[PDB]
Each structure stands twice: as structure tokens, then as C-alpha cells.
From Swiss-Prot, chains A, B, C:
Binding partners and assembly: Homotrimer. Each appendage is a homotrimer of gp12*.
Domain of life of the native organism: Viruses
Portion of the full-length sequence here: 692 to 854 of 854
Binding residues annotated for ATP, in chain numbering: 55-104
Cellular localisation: Virion
PTM annotation: Autocleaved to produce the 74 kDa gp12* assembly attached to the phage particles. Autocleavage of the C-terminus is a posttrimerization event that is followed by an ATP-dependent release.
Residues at the active site: 4
Swiss-Prot/TrEMBL domain comment: The N-terminus has three domains that function to attach the appendages to the phage, digest the cell wall teichoic acids, and bind irreversibly to the host. The C-terminus is an autochaperone that aids trimerization.
Effect on the protein upon substituting residue 4 to Q: Complete loss of autocleavage. No effect on trimerization or enzymatic teichoic acid degrading activity
Provenance organism: Bacillus phage phi29
Role this protein plays: Structural component of the 12 appendages that hang from the lower collar. Adhesion protein that binds to the host cell surface during virus attachment and mediates teichoic acids degradation.
Protein name: Pre-neck appendage protein
Length: 163, 163, 163
């Protein structure tokens, strides 16, 4: 599945397999009828946004998140691009990456993804969410139930094609 | 385009350019009024799920498809992660990878993708599917017809923006 | 974000952050009610479709844009595949990279993307487009306003979850 990093609303960990929505630019478990943006994933073969949309790195970024380049001219007349230094950045500091921060989550946005399900979820039907757990509904397609629901677990697991 | 591997329902080859849907977790050619999940693609630059959701491999995976890591402690107290071997794994019996099996197909899920079209399909419009071949409809956007439909070809080709 | 290269209508340059649509298979700024396919992006990094649907290159492609491979056999019985050269390819022309051509644009299709906004755009709501600039509407989800709208600029910037 194809994924990006998002921060949780309360900074706490949302476990693998929960369906999430956005609230105030941050993720929380989705509730019924809310826009489901994706699922917390451990299988993402492609993850993105590890250094995206943060203006506290080594080089200065523009308002769109792009690196700002200076056009440098040499004495001969050769012109080349050089990134602008960020005054804030400390070359001798060890910054903590998103993968080591509990509030930052890999969210699968597209592809076949494992999802927590209740007892109502059926192969070949869609889903909605209650407390981040799939219930029978109209979003996406359930591919197969790989771990049947158990009363004593409180959930089962299905592969869902998320788009 | 961005793609994943899916298995065909009958275990036979679906040729490139056909629109596909899911039935019982496997792919077949899409028909009237069905959810079109994507297109068999030869142009995918990113392709995923080659070894996803394999619970009979060498390394143990959890119910969500993630690798289960042992927490290992050195004599000093230093801790690190180590994959857990699978008890149900048998190195004796044969295994051929998905990429080498005919039943496993690259399905483009997102991006500009070439699609088989009928005589009703028009640039700038959406498509539906009949026998996996695009017909004038409501899904996606036709970017350009690259091979016009002719009779006795039975199809033409268009680039479609699939999302 | 996940992005692909698209050619612009009339070879026009479209700056970062503008919402785009397709017209005759080429991109232009989106207007009210039009289908928004994505946003001009500087945050995509690695971008698909640099070679996709180029029937004017060094190797021959089939009608679906897939590379055509010839089956080669050696004297000693070994079989392998190799791309079929295009005999109508002239290496003397020195073809120019997609990135140095004004008409080719990186369009973010999926993920968290910075978008130009007007004064009506609100966190947690969707957007429509006027001259490629977001206005309050029904598409996507505004994650957060990172640069509030100002008179001095005539726009603000928000991170929008595009799917």
C-alpha cells in the first residue's frame, strides 16, 4: 500500500488496522458517516512525508514546501542553483525523526490494506467505521476476511481495497 | 502509474488494457455497474504487494501483515529488533514468486493508464466497462484516444486518468 | 505526495500550488465545477511517467505503452529478453529532459499537498477552484491553513488531502 505520515489529534498511538479520519489537520479513529482517509498500516511499501511541511530543517523552504534555491553566478558567468541555509538549523544537533515519535503514524491511503472488522463485515461488500473498526457499509471493497471476528478479541481482520 | 499485484479469479491471464473489478478477493474483467478498481498495466513505475499477506514465509507476520520483531537485549541493556522465524514455514516444499506466476497481475490503480475502448468512448468524458472494455460512462477521464476504435479490431486504445 | 508528469494546454507554465483539470488530454488551471485532477507540486520528489507513452524514444512500445521485448537465443542455448530498438530513433538529436521543458508539469495526484487558497477556504471543509485557486467547496479535505490569506499576496496556502 501507498502511505504518508500523519500526526494523531491527541498525540497518542493509534494501533495498526484502525480506520482514521482528519480533525484539525490531525488523525483520529473514524466514526460512522465520517470521511475515512485511510488505515494505520505496517505493510506500506512506500511511505512519504518524513520531512514534509515543516519549516525547521537545514535548508529554507517556500510556502509550498519546496526547497528555495539561490541563483549563484561565477566570475566566468556560469550560473548554478544553491539552496538557502536555514539560520535555525544546528549542524551539530541530532534531530528525532517521525518514525521515532509516537504521535506520527504511517497511514495507508491507497491499495490492499488490513483493517479491523466487526461481525457485520462481509467479503465483497463495503464498510463504514465505528471507533475506527469497520462495520458493514458503502466505502471501499472487502477483498477477504483473513482473521474471522472473535467475540473474545472484539474484532476480526480483512484485506480491504482502499482508494 | 501506481500499481499492486492481484490474483485472477480463474487463475488465467487477463491481457493488458482490460478494466478489472474484484470478486471473492480476486480480479476479473469489469461489467456494467460494477466498481472498476483499475486496469491491467505494463507501464507501472511503482508496483507493490509482491510478498504482502504471505503467512507461510520464513519470517512470522502478525494478523495485519506486519513483521513480528523480537525485542533482544544485550548484556549491557542495549535493545534491538530481530525478526521472528515462522514455525509453520517449510523449506522443503516449492515456492515460485508472484512475479513469475501467470495468475498474478499488475493492476494500475492510480495514474495515466492505457485502456481498451469501444466505439462510444470520447476524449474528455468518463467510462464504464463491458467485458473489461471501456464504454462511454461516468468513471475517470479520457485523456486521449491513441488508437482509434476500428471494426474487426473490436477495440481502440485511450489514455485514461484513473483515480 | 504521489505525482505524475502531465503536459500543459498550449504549453503554458502553471505555477506551484494551482489546482488543475484536463482539457483535450492536457492540463490547465481548474475553474468552477470542473473536475480537479490534482495540484502543481514541488514536494513530490521521485514522480512517474517520464517515459510513459513515449512512442518517440529509443525502444519500441506496444499500443498500451509497454516495452516490446525480443526473445534472443545464444549459440549455447541460453534465452533472454531485450528491448526492441526503434529504428526511427536518431541519437544525434540530443532529446531534452521533461524537466527542462516548460510544458511538462509535476502534478500531485494523491496525498498531502500545498494548495493556493482564497479568503473563503476553511480547515476541515472541501474546495472548488476559480482560476486554479481553491475556494470553499466539495472536493478533498482542507487539513490546515499554513499561510493565511493576505491582501498583499492575493492568496494563502493550505495543506489539502487530495485523493
Amino acid at each position: 500500500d501507498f502511505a504518508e505520515y500523519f500526526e494523531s489529534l491527541g498525540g497518542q498511538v493509534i494501533e495498526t488496522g484502525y480506520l482514521v479520519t482528519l480533525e484539525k489537520g490531525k488523525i483520529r479513529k473514524a466514526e460512522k458517516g465520517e470521511k475515512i482517509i485511510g488505515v494505520i498500516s505496517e505493510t506500506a511499501g512506500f511511505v512519504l512525508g518524513e520531512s514534509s511541511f515543516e519549516w525547521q530543517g537545514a535548508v529554507l523552504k517556500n510556502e509550498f514546501g519546496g526547497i528555495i534555491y539561490e541563483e549563484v553566478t561565477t566570475e566566468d558567468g556560469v550560473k548554478f542553483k544553491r539552496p538557502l541555509p536555514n539560520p535555525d538549523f544546528d549542524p551539530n544537533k541530532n534531530y528525532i525523526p517521525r518514525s521515532q515519535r509516537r504521535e506520527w503514524h504511517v497511514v495507508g491511503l491507497l491499495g490492499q490494506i488490513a483493517v479491523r472488522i466487526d461481525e457485520t463485515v462481509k467479503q465483497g461488500h463495503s464498510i463504514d467505521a465505528v471507533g475506527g473498526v469497520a462495520t458493514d457499509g458503502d466505502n471501499f471493497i472487502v477483498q477477504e476476511i483473513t482473521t474471522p471476528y472473535t467475540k473474545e478479541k472484539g474484532y476480526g481482520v480483512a484485506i480491504v481495497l482502499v482508494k
